[PDB]
Coordinates of C-alpha atoms in Angstrom, one line a residue:
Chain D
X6 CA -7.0 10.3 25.6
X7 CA -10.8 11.2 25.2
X8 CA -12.3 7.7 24.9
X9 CA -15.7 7.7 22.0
X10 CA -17.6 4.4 22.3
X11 CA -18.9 3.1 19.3
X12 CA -21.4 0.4 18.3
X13 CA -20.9 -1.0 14.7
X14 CA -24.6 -1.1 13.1
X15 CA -25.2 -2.4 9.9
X16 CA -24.9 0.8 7.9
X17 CA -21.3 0.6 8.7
X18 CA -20.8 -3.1 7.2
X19 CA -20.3 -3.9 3.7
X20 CA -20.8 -6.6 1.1
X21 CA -17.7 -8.2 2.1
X22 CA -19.1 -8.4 5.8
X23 CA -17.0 -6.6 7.3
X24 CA -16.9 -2.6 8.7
X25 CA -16.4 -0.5 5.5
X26 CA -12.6 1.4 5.4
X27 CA -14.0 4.9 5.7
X28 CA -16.7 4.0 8.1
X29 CA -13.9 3.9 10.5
X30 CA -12.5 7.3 9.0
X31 CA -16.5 8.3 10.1
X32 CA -16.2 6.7 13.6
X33 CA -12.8 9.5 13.9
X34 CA -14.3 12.5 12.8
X35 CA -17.4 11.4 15.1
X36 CA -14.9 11.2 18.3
X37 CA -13.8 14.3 17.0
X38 CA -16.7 15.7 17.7
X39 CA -17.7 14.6 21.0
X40 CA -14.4 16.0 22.1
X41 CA -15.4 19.1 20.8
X42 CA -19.1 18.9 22.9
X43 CA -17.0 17.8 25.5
X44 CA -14.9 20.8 25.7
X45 CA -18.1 23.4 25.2
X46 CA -16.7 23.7 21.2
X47 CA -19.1 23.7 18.8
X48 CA -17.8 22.4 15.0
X49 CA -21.7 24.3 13.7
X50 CA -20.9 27.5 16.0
X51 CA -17.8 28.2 14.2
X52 CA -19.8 26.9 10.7
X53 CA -22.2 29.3 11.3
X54 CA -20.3 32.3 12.0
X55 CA -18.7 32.1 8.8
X56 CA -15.1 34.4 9.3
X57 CA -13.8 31.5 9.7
X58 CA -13.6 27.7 9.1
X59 CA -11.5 25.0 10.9
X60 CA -11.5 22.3 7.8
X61 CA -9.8 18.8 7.9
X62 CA -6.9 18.9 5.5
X63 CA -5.9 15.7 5.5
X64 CA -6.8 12.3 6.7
X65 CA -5.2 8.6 6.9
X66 CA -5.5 5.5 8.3
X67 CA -4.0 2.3 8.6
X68 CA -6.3 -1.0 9.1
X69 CA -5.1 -3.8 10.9
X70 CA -8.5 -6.3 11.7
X71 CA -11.9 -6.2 10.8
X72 CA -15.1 -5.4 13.0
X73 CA -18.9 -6.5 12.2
X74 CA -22.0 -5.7 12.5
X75 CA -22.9 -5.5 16.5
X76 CA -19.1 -5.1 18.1
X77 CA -18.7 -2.5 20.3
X78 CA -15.8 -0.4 19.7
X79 CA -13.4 2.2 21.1
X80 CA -12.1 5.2 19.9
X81 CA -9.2 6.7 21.8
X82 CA -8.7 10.1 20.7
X83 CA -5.6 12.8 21.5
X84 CA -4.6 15.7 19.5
X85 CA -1.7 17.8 19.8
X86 CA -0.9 21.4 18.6
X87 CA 1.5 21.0 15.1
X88 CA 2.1 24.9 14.7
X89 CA 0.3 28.2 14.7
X90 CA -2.3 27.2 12.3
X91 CA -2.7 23.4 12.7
X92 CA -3.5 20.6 14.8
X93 CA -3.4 16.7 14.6
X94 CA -5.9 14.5 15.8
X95 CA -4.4 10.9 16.5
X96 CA -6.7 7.7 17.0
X97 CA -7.0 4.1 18.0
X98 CA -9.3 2.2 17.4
X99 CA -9.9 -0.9 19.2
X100 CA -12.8 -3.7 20.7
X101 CA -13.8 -2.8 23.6
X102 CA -14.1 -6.2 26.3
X103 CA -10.3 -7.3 24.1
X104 CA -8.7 -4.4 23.2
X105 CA -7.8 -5.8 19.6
X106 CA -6.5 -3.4 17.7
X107 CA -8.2 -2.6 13.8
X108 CA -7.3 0.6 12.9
X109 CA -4.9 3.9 13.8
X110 CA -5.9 7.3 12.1
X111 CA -4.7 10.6 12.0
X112 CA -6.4 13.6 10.9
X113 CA -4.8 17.2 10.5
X114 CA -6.9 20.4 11.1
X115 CA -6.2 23.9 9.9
X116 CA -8.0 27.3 11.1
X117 CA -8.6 29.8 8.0
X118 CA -10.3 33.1 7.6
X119 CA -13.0 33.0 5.4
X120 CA -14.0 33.8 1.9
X121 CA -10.0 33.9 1.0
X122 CA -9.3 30.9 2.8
X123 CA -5.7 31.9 4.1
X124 CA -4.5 30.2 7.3
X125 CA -5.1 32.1 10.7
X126 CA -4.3 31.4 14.5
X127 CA -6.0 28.3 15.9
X128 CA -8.3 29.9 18.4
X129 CA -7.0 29.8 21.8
X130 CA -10.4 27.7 23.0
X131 CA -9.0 25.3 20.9
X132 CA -5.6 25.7 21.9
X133 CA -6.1 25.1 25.4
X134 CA -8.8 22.3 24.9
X135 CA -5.8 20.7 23.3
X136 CA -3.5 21.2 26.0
X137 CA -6.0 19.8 28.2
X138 CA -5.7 16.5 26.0
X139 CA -2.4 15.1 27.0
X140 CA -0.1 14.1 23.6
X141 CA 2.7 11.9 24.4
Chain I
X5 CA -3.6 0.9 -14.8
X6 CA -5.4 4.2 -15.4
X7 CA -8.6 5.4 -15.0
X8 CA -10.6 8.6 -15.1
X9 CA -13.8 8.4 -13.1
X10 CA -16.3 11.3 -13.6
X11 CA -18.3 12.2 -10.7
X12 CA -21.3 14.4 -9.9
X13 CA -21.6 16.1 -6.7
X14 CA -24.7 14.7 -4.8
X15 CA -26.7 16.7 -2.2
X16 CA -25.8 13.9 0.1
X17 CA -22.0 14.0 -0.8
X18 CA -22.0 17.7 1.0
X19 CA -22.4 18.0 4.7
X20 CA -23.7 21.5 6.7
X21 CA -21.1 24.2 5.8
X22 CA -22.3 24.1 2.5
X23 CA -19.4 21.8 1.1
X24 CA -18.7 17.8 0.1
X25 CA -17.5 16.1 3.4
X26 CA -14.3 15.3 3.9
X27 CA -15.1 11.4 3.6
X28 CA -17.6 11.4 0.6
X29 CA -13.9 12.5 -1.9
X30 CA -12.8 9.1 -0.3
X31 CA -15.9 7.4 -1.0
X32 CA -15.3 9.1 -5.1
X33 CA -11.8 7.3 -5.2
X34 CA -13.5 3.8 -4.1
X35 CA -15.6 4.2 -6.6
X36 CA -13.1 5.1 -9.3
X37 CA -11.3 1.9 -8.2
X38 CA -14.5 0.0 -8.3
X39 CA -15.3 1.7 -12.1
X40 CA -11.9 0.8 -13.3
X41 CA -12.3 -3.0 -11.9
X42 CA -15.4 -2.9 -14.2
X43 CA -14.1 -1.6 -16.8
X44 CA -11.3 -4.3 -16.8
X45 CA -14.3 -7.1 -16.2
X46 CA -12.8 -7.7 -12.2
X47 CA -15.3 -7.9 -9.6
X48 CA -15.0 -7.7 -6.5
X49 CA -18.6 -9.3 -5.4
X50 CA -16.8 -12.3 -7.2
X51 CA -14.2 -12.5 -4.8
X52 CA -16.5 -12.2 -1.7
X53 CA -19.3 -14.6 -3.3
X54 CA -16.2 -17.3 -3.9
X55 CA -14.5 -16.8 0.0
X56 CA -11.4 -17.8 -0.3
X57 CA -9.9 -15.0 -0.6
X58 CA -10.7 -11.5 0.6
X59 CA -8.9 -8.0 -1.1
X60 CA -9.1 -5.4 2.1
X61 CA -8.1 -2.3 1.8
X62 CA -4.9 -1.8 4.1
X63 CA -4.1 2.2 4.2
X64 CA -5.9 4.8 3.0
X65 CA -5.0 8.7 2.6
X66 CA -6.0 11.9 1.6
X67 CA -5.0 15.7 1.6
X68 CA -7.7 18.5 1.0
X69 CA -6.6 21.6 -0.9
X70 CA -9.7 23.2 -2.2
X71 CA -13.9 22.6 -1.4
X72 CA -16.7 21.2 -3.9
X73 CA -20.1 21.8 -3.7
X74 CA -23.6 20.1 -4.8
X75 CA -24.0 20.0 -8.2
X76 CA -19.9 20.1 -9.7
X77 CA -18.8 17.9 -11.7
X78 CA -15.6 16.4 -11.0
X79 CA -13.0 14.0 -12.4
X80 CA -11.4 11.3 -10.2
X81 CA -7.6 10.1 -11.9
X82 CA -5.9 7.2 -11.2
X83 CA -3.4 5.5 -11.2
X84 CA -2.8 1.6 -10.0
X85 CA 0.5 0.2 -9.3
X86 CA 1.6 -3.0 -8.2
X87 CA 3.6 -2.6 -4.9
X88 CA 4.1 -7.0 -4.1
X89 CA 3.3 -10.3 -4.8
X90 CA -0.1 -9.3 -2.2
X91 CA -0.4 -5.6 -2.7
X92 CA -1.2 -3.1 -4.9
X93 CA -1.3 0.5 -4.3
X94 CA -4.0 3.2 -5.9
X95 CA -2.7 6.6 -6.5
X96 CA -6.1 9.7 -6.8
X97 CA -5.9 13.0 -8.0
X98 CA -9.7 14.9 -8.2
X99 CA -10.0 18.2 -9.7
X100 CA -13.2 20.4 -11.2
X101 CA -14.0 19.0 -14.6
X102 CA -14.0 22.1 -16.0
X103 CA -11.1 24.7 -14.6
X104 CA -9.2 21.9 -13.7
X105 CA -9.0 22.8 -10.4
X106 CA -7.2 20.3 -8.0
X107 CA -9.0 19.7 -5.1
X108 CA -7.9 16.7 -3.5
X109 CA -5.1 13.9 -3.9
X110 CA -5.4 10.7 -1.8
X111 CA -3.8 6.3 -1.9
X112 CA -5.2 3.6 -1.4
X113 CA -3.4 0.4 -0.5
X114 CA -5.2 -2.9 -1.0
X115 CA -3.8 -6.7 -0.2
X116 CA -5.0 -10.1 -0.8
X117 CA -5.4 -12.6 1.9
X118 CA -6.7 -15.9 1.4
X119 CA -9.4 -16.8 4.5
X120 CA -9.8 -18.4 6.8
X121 CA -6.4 -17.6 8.4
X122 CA -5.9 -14.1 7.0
X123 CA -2.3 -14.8 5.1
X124 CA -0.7 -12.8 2.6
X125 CA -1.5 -14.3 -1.0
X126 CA -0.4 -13.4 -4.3
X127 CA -3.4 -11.1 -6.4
X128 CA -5.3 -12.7 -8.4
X129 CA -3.3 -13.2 -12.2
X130 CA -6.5 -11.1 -14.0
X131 CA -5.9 -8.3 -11.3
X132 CA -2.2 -8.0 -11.8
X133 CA -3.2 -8.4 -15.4
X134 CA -5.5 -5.4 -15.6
X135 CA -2.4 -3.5 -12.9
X136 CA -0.2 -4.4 -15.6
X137 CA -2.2 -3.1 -18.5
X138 CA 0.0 -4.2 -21.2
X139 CA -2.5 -3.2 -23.8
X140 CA -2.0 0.4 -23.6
X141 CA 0.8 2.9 -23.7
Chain E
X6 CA -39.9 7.9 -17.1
X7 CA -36.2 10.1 -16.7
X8 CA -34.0 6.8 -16.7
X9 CA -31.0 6.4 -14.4
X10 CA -28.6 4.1 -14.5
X11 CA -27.1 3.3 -11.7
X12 CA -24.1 0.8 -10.5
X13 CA -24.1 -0.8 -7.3
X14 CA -20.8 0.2 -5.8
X15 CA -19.7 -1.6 -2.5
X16 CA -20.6 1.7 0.2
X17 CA -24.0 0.3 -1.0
X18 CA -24.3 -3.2 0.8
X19 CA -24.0 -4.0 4.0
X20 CA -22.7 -7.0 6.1
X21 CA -26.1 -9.1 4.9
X22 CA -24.2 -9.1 1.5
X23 CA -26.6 -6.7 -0.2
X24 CA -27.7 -3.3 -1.0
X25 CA -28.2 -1.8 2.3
X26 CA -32.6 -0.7 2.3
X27 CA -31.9 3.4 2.5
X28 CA -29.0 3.4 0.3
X29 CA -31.8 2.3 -2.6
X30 CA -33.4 5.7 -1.4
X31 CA -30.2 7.5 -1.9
X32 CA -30.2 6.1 -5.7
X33 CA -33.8 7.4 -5.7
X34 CA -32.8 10.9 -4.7
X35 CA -29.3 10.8 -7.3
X36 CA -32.0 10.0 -10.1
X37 CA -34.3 13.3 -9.1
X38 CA -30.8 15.5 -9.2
X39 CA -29.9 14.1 -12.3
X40 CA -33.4 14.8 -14.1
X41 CA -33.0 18.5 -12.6
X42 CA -30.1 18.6 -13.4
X43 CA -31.0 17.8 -17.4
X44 CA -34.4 20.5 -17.2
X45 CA -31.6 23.0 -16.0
X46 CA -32.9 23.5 -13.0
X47 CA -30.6 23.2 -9.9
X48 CA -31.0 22.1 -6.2
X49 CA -28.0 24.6 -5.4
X50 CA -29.2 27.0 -6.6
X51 CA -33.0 27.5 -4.7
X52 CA -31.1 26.0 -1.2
X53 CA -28.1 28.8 -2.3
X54 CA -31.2 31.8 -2.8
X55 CA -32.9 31.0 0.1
X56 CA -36.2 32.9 0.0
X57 CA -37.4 29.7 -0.7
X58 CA -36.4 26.0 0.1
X59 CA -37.6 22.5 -2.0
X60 CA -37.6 19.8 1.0
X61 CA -38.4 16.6 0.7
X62 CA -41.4 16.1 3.1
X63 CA -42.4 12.3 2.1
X64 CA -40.3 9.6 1.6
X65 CA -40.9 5.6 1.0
X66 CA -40.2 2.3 0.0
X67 CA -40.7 -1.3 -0.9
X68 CA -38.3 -3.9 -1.5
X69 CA -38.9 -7.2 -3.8
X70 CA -35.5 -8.8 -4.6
X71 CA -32.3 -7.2 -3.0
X72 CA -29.3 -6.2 -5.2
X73 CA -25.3 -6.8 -4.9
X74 CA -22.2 -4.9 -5.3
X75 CA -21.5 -4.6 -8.8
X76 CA -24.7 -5.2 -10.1
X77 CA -26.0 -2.3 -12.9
X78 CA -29.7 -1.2 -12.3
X79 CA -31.9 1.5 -13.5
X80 CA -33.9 3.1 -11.8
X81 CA -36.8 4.5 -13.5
X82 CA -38.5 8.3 -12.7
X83 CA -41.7 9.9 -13.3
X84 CA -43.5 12.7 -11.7
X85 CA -46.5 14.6 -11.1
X86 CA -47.7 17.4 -9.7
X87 CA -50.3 16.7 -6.4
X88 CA -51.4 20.0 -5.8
X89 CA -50.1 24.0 -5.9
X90 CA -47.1 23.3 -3.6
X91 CA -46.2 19.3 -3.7
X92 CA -45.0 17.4 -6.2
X93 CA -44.6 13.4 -6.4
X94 CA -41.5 11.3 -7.8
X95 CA -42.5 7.5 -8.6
X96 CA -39.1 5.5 -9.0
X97 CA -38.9 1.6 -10.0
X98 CA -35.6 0.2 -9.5
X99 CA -34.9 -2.7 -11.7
X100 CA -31.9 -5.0 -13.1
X101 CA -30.7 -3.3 -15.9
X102 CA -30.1 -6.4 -18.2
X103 CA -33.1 -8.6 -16.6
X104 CA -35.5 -5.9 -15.7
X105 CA -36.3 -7.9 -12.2
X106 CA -37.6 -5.3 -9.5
X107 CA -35.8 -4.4 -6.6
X108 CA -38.3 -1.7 -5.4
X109 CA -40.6 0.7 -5.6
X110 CA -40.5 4.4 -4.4
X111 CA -42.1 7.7 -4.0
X112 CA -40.5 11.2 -2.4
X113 CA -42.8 13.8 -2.4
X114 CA -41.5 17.4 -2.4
X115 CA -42.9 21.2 -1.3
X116 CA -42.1 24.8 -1.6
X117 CA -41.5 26.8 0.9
X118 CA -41.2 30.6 1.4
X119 CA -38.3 31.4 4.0
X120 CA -37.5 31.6 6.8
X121 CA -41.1 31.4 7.9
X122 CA -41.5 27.9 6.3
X123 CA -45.1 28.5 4.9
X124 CA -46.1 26.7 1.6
X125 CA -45.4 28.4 -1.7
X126 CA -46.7 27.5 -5.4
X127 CA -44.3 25.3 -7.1
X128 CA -41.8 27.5 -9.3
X129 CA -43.4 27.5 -13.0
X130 CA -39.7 26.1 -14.3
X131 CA -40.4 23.0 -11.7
X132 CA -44.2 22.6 -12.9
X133 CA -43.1 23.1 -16.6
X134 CA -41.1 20.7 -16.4
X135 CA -42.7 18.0 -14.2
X136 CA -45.7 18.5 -17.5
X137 CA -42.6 17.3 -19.5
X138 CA -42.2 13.8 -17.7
X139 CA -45.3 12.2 -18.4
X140 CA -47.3 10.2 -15.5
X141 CA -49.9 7.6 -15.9
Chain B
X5 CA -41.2 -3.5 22.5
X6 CA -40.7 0.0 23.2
X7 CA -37.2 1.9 23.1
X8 CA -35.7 5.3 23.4
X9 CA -32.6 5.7 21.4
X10 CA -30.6 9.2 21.6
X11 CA -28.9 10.5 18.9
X12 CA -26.6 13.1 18.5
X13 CA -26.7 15.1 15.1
X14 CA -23.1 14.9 13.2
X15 CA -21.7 16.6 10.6
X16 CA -21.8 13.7 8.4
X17 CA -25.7 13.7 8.8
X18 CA -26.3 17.5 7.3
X19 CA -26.1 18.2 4.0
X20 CA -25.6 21.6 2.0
X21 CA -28.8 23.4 2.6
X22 CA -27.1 22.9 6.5
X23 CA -30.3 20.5 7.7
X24 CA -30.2 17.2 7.9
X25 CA -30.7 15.1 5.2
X26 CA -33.8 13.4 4.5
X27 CA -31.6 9.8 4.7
X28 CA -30.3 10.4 7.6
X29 CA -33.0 10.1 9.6
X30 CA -34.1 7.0 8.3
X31 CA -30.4 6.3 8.7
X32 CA -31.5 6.5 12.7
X33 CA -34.0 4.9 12.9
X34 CA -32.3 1.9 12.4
X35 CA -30.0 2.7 14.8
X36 CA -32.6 2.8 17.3
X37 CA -33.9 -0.8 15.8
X38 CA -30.8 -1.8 16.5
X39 CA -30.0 -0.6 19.8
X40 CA -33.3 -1.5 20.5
X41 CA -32.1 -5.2 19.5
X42 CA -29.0 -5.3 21.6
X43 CA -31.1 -4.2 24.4
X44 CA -32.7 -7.2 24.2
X45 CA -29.7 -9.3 23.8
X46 CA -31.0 -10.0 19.5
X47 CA -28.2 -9.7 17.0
X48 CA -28.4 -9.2 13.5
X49 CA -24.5 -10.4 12.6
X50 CA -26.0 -13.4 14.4
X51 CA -28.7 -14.2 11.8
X52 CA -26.4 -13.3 8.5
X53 CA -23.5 -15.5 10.2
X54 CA -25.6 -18.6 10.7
X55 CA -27.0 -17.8 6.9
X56 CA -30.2 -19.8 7.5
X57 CA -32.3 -16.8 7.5
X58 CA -32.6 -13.7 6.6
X59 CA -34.1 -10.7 8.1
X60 CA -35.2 -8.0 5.2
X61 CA -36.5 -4.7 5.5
X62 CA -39.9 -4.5 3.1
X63 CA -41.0 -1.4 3.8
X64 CA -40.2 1.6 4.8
X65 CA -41.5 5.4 4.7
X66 CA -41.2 8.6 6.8
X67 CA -42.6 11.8 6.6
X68 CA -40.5 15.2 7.6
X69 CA -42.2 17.8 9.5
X70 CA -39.1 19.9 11.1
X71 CA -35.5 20.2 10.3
X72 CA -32.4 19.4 12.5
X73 CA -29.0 21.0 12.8
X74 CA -25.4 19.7 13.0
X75 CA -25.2 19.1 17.0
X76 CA -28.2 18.9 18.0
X77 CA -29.2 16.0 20.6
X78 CA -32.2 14.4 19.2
X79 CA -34.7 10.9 20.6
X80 CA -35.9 8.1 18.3
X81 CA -38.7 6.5 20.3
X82 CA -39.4 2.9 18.7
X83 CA -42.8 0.9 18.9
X84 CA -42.3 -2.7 17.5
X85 CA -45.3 -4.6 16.7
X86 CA -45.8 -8.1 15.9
X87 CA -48.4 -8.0 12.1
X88 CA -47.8 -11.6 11.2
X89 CA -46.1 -14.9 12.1
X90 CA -43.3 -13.6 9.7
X91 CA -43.6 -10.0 9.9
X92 CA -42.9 -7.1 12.4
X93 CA -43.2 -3.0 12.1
X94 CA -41.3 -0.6 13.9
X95 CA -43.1 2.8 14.3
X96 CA -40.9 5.5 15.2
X97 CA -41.1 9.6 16.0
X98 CA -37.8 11.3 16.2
X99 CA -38.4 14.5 18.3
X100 CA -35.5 17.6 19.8
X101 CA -34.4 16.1 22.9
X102 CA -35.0 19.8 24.9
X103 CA -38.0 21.2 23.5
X104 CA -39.5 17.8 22.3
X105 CA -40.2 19.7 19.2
X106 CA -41.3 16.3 16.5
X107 CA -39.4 16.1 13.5
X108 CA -40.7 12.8 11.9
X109 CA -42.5 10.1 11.6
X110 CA -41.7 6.5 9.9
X111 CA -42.2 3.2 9.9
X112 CA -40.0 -0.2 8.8
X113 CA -41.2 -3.4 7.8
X114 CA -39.2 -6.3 8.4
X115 CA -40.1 -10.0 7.4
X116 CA -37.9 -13.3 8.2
X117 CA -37.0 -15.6 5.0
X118 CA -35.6 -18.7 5.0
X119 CA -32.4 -18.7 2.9
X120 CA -31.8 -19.7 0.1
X121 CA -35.6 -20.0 -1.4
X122 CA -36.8 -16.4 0.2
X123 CA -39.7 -17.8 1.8
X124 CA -41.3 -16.3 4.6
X125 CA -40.6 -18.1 7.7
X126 CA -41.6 -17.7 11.2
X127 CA -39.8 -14.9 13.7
X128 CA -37.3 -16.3 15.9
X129 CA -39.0 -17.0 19.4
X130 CA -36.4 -15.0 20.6
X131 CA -37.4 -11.8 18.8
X132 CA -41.0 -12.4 19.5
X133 CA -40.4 -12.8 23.0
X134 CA -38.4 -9.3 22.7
X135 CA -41.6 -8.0 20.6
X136 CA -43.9 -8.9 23.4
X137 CA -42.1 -7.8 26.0
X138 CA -44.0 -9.6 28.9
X139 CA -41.3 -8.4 31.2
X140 CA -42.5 -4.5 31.0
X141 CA -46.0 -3.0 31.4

């Protein structure tokens, strides 16, 4: 796994006092993202260029325990290849000093040539940063 | 329960390639859930201002099929089922108010607990009431 | 005053139990879209031309009395016109059913030419209808 | 007090004219109050849990001189200043973290209340201590 620490801040928190649901969803696509760094990708290089877009297609998660305000949280991140077009991001998301468990979240990626939007070929960069990323 | 939730697309709602963020359609189903708990006279603030029980939300899920952008108008439908004695399960479609266009579908899954010790209880009989919605066809 | 209504929904608050400070900004900024958006003007469309840009260049707040999920308020919008290229938005944001104050606001807003980013004159449509709105 | 906070720009923080949105970097700001405060060892869950006190934002404002982009690495630096018994104001400037290019600058306002009445009340000597800062030139 790529590991993303987190700190909860208060933005993240809700009425009910707890971490709001897609806050966490946030806290993904955030991990996401530093994988991306990480592996010299660039989520606004690929924006910018504007043949093509890699869009999330779908996202869930399941919540098991609450954080607040302050915790410190991990986000355990790997991703495996699903077929030509399309890859799957899976994460954990725990405290960090007890490892309690309060969320696991997929999300699913697609690679499509732009304006007509029709699926193409997961660049290889991203194919091989994946591979990198071991998915048991 | 049904409920259609119209919806406009806010700057803030779209993110830097020029289209709403995957998270903000989320954010529109909460909101059509927290609409149709109005519109049925639930609150939710009552349940947190009364702690003793709490109403998480358990599972969410969503699947993209087409973008938005600042400025549409969209419609959020739902649907609201009763899945247990503890859980109920919300059912989104969100599509262009105009052509109709489906751009999204998503669930929510929601349970009551009572606090402190976090056990299953039974929604509270006005909830399943509204769920139920006897009143219409 | 453009009047907005505006309910409190949960993403709002925060772990305190209230409406989280900046998110009564956000209802600030909804309230501006929503009057353009009734003069038939359009932030999509200048940031989609792109000659010229509309930023936001000032923004602030005070808070009185702090809101709660659920809770419907309105929050109230006048403008005027501070100079060739700037324009000011006053909001109040009150109970709905009581009128108590939650805040008070201002964003202020300029024209720029692109890509340079050197002031231009306020579109007529924007100052036409800003003389619409009337300010103390 | 004095902090540095860095701050990554996510995609989250843009919006569709592909800058960041105005929000957002008030949005970090607080982060950097916050970090700031668990530098110190200061919670804010702390305060809302004991429910004794509050700690409310007043004020705040910020004024935009430069935009940011989806990845870049920006600094918040933070200047907390005692103004009253009850009162403290965090001055911030959030600048590129390469070119040191400065964005913004803003301020927050926050005052301590004794809960439930909302009178102002006296910092904890904890967060004063923090404010002064004796420890650092």
């Amino acid at each position: 796994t790529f590991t993303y620490e987190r700190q909860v801040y208060l933005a993240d928190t809700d009425g009910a006092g707890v971490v709001y649901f897609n806050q966490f969803l946030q806290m993904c696509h955030e991990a996401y993202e530093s994988w991306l760094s990480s592996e010299h990708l660039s989520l606004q290089n690929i924006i910018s260029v504007g043949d093509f877009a890699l869009p999330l297609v779908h996202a869930s998660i399941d919540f098991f325990a609450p954080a607040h305000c302050g915790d410190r949280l991990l986000v355990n991140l790997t991703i495996t290849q699903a077929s030509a077009h399309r890859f799957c991001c899976d994460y954990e998301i725990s405290q960090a000093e007890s490892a309690q468990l309060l969320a696991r979240a997929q999300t699913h990626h697609v690679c499509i040539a732009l304006p007509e939007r029709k699926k193409a070929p997961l660049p290889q960069p991203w194919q091989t940063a994946i591979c990198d990323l071991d998915h048991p």
